[PDB]
Amino acid sequence: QSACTLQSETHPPLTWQKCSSGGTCTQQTGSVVIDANWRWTHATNSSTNCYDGNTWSSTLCPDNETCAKNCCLDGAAYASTYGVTTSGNSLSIDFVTQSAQKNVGARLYLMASDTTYQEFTLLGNEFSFDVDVSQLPCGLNGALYFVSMDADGGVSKYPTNTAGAKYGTGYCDSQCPRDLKFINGQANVEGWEPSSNNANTGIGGHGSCCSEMDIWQANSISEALTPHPCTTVGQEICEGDGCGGTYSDNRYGGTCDPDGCDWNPYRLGNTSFYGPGSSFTLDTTKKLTVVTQFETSGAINRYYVQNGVTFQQPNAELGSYSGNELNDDYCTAEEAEFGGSSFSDKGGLTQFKKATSGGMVLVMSLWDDYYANMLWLDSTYPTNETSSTPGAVRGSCSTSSGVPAQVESQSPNAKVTFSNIKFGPIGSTGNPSG
Numbered sequence: 281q282s283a284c285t286l287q288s289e290t291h292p293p294l295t296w297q298k299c300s301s302g303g304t305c306t307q308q309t310g311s312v313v314i315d316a317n318w319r320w321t322h323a324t325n326s327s328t329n330c331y332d333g334n335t336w337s338s339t340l341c342p343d344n345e346t347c348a349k350n351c352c353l354d355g356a357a358y359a360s361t362y363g364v365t366t367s368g369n370s371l372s373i374d375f376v377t378q379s380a381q382k383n384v385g386a387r388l389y390l391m392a393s394d395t396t397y398q399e400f401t402l403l404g405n406e407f408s409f410d411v412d413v414s415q416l417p418c419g420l421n422g423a424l425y426f427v428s429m430d431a432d433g434g435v436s437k438y439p440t441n442t443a444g445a446k447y448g449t450g451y452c453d454s455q456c457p458r459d460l461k462f463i464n465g466q467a468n469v470e471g472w473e474p475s476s477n478n479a480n481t482g483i484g485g486h487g488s489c490c491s492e493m494d495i496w497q498a499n500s501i502s503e504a505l506t507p508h509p510c511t512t513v514g515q516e517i518c519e520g521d522g523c524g525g526t527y528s529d530n531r532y533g534g535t536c537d538p539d540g541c542d543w544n545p546y547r548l549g550n551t552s553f554y555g556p557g558s559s560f561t562l563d564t565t566k567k568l569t570v571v572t573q574f575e576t577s578g579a580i581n582r583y584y585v586q587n588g589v590t591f592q593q594p595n596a597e598l599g600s601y602s603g604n605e606l607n608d609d610y611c612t613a614e615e616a617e618f619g620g621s622s623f624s625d626k627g628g629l630t631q632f633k634k635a636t637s638g639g640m641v642l643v644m645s646l647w648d649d650y651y652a653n654m655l656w657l658d659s660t661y662p663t664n665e666t667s668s669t670p671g672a673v674r675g676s677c678s679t680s681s682g683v684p685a686q687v688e689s690q691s692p693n694a695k696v697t698f699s700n701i702k703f704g705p706i707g708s709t710g711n712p713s714g
């Protein structure tokens with residue numbers, strides 16, 4: 281697609297700290313950009329929609345290539361349309377925003393310039409952030425994560441995409457998502473099927489795969505940390521159900537691992553660690569600091585800080601694994617005890633280390649789940665299982681929770697706030713900000 285300018289595109293600024301092993305941190309100035317799927321897609325020389333509701337224009341978009349030639353992405357009114365605001369080092373995303381139409385949540389990328397994404401090399405480094413999840417009920421997910429996206433959003437590889445990172449193109453993740461309207465400088469109209477339950481969405485014939493590091497999948501009830509390997513490390517197109525993931529009939533039939541090696545302390549047995557109020561180790565009614573360290577072995581370490589008190593990731597025992605480091609012994613034990621083979625099939629932490637050794641883009645989002653109601657995060661899943669099934673119970677939410685239309689109606693003022701991002705060598709991010 282090209283870019284159009286009927287609406288101006290001004291990326292909300294966002295600062296973050298780059299820390300050094302020598303013990304000091306220096307402020308960096310970036311900004312955030314909304315993913316292309318949220319945008320108005322229209323004809324290049326008129327206001328006629330190329331996509332509207334859950335359908336493509338059959339005249340502007342008779343095929344993927346003609347559609348991309350005929351159509352452009354336009355600018356976003358971040359606060360008034362999308363409920364996205366920033367202040368200094370803080371980013372807030374509202375759940376439901378009513379303008380001329382309804383908007384639900386957002387997916388945002390951290391930029392390096394107005395036309396390029398910031399890339400982070402995670403291996404050997406740690407990433408710290410503060411989060412307020414107090415306004416996130418059952419069924420919502422305020423996510424902070426990394427994906428192996430191109431810094432230009434795909435423009436150099438696919439010159440029929442001239443919109444680029446400035447307009448939030450080029451997304452990919454471990455689901456190999458097929459709901460994206462543009463992939464590789466082509467529309468996704470071929471094979472398009474409208475969603476049953478979401479007036480704005482559908483599933484196309486193509487998806488967009490890449491490695492994904494889920495630092496933070498969370499609401500006020502549950503949280504998870506999850507690396508996902510893919511056999512191709514960076515962004516790559518996939519065809520139909522060969523994509524696997526959420527948007528295919530067969531979840532596990534693709535090149536990425538859509539499940540990952542997940543670490544959810546509640547799922548692992550510590551049901552007192554994270555939740556609302558003073559009965560939990562971490563009180564989700566209050567802001568908390570989350571630090572994630574990527575040691576060069578390929579294992580992942582985690583600690584938290586709240587009110588000046590530090591807690592390592594709680595210990596878990598699973599089969600012959602015991603500890604609090606997410607390492608290959610953990611991931612192997614998890615597959616043995618909970619089931620599944622996707623993580624190991626895709627090469628495990630060794631394959632995942634190829635992603636963290638390269639550049640990855642920072643994503644912050646707020647979503648509800650039109651496929652599984654977020655039950656995999658915060659409830660019992662599948663819903664016919666009980667606590668007698670190892671790993672079935674992931675949180676205390678009812679198996680009836682998280683229906684998108686219901687939570688949108690009941691909790692429209694829900695929101696997530698991410699703040700005080702700090703990044704640098706392991707051991708460095710707790711030192712004074714600059």
Ligand SMILES: OC[C@H]1O[C@@H](O[C@H]2[C@H](O)[C@@H](O)[C@H](O)O[C@@H]2CO)[C@H](O)[C@@H](O)[C@@H]1O
Pocket residue numbers: 455494506526538539540542656657661662
């Ligand atoms: O695609 C939704 C969500 O899935 C997460 O994996 C789940 C999976 O959905 C479920 O079928 C299995 O039983 O459990 C795993 C781990 O909870 C995945 O980790 C997320 O990244 C993804 O957003």
Ligand SMILES: *[C@@H]1O[C@H](CO)[C@@H](O)[C@H](O)[C@H]1NC(C)=O
Pocket residue numbers: 549550551552553561591592593594595
């Ligand atoms: C949960 O984790 C916290 C922090 O490590 C610990 O203090 C507490 O004893 C744990 N509870 C259980 C049941 O494992």
Ligand SMILES: *[C@@H]1O[C@H](CO)[C@@H](O)[C@H](O)[C@H]1NC(C)=O
Pocket residue numbers: 662664665666
């Ligand atoms: C729940 O339903 C699934 C269907 O996929 C089945 O595999 C499983 O055996 C069922 N579990 C129980 C405890 O009935």
Ligand SMILES: [Co+2]
Pocket residue numbers: 486519
């Ligand atoms: Co194709």
Ligand SMILES: [Co+2]
Pocket residue numbers: 521529530
């Ligand atoms: Co099939």
Ligand SMILES: [Co+2]
Pocket residue numbers: 575577579605
């Ligand atoms: Co280690």
